[PDB]
Structure formats: structure tokens, C-alpha cells
Amino acid sequence: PLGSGVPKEIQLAELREALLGIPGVTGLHDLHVWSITSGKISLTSHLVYDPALVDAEALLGTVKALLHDRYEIEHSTLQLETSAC
Amino acid sequence: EIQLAELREALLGIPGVTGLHDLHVWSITSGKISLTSHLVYDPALVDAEALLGTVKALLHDRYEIEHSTLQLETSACA
Ligand SMILES: [Zn+2]
Ligand SMILES: [Zn+2]
Ligand SMILES: [Zn+2]
Ligand SMILES: [Zn+2]
Ligand SMILES: [Zn+2]
């Protein structure tokens, strides 16, 4: 849903909602989405989660699946934390 | 570039796989690589769904193949 070419801020807005919509996720900041080559899209982000609701390793698996299966993102780096920076 | 001989060995090297035929590997000009194949397996040794998962992982993680169609069968085609 980010399409070919430079991702728009309104497509990133929908990507933010998708990540914030995952059970256990409380927060989201320092989102980076860019294209290195034609087609390939990379993502880095900080994710704030409730450790009482979801396990870190489990949440990481759920986010990787969403980013890969929906957005076709192979190359991602996600910092999971219990409180925002 | 993919070595098909080495790809065949990799698939035949998976525990439970007894046979391999009708292998198709081709590239569209965007670079994306597709694969179709018939895979003969021993149902006493491995579960179909489990084997399918193992083959998809190999094709994705080693060969960067997203687009694949694999026919799992307990005996080879005539
Ligand atoms: Zn940043
Ligand atoms: Zn992939
Ligand atoms: Zn942070
Ligand atoms: Zn054929
Ligand atoms: Zn066959």
C-alpha cells in the first residue's frame, strides 16, 4: 500500500495506524521508510509495547509478518521498549 | 545467477523428499525469480504441510523467491 516511488506521508499515516493497531503496541516514534533500489523498501522504527499484554519476541514476529506480507518489506529494524525515549 | 544443479541437490537434500521433476525456474526483467516443481515425498517420514513450510523457507531465505508453486505427491507422475 506504499506503492512504487517515494512513499507519501498519508501512506505512512496508514502504516502508523497498522502498527499502532497491533495488540500490545502502545506507542510509535522515529519511523524511517526509504527505497535503496527500485522496488525494495526498508523500515526502521521504535515500538512502545505493554509487557503485561505481549511478549517482545512474539510482538517482533507479528510486526515482521505484517511488514513482509502486507507492505513487501524484507529489510526492517525495530527497537521494542516498555517506555518511550 | 542460480545454479539449477545445486538447487536440485538442495531440494533433494531436505529430509522426507524422495524425488523431484518438472522443475521450472524463470526471471521477469524486474529481477524477481519464480519457481514451480513437483516434489515426491515419503508420508511416513514427513507431513505435507510441514515439508511445504520447509521448502518455502529454503526458496525464500536462500534464493529470494516470493512466487512459487510446489506439487507435493507420494508417488512420481508417469
Ligand atoms: Zn530517526
Ligand atoms: Zn520475502
Ligand atoms: Zn524510542
Ligand atoms: Zn514442465
Ligand atoms: Zn509429478
**Residue B1 CA to ligand 2 centre (angstroms):** 18
Element (H, E) at B56: helix B48-61
Nearest to B50 by CA among A31, B42, A8: B42
E strands present in B1-78: 17-27, 33-41, 67-73
Nearest to B11 by CA among B43, B44, B41: B41
Q: Is A17 helix (H, G, I), strand (E, B) or coil?
A: helix
CB-based burial label for A47 (10 Å; 0-12, 13-18, 19+): buried
Residue B42 counted as an annotated binding residue: no
Q: Which residues of B touch A39 (CB under 8 A)?
A: 30-32
Distance from CA of B53 to the nearest CA of A (A): 15
Resolution to one decimal, Å: 2.3
Ligand with an atom nearest the CA of residue B41: 5
Domains and CATH numbers, chain A: 9-81 (3.30.70.1350)
E strands present in chain A: 25-35, 41-49, 75-81
Q: Which triple of cell numbers denotes residue B26?
A: 524463470
**Residue B71 CA to ligand 5 centre (angstroms):** 7
Distance from CA of B18 to the nearest CA of A (A): 31
Distance from CA of B67 to the nearest CA of A (A): 12
- Chain pair A-B, CB pairs under 8 angstroms: 4
In the PDB record, what is the listed experimental method?
X-ray
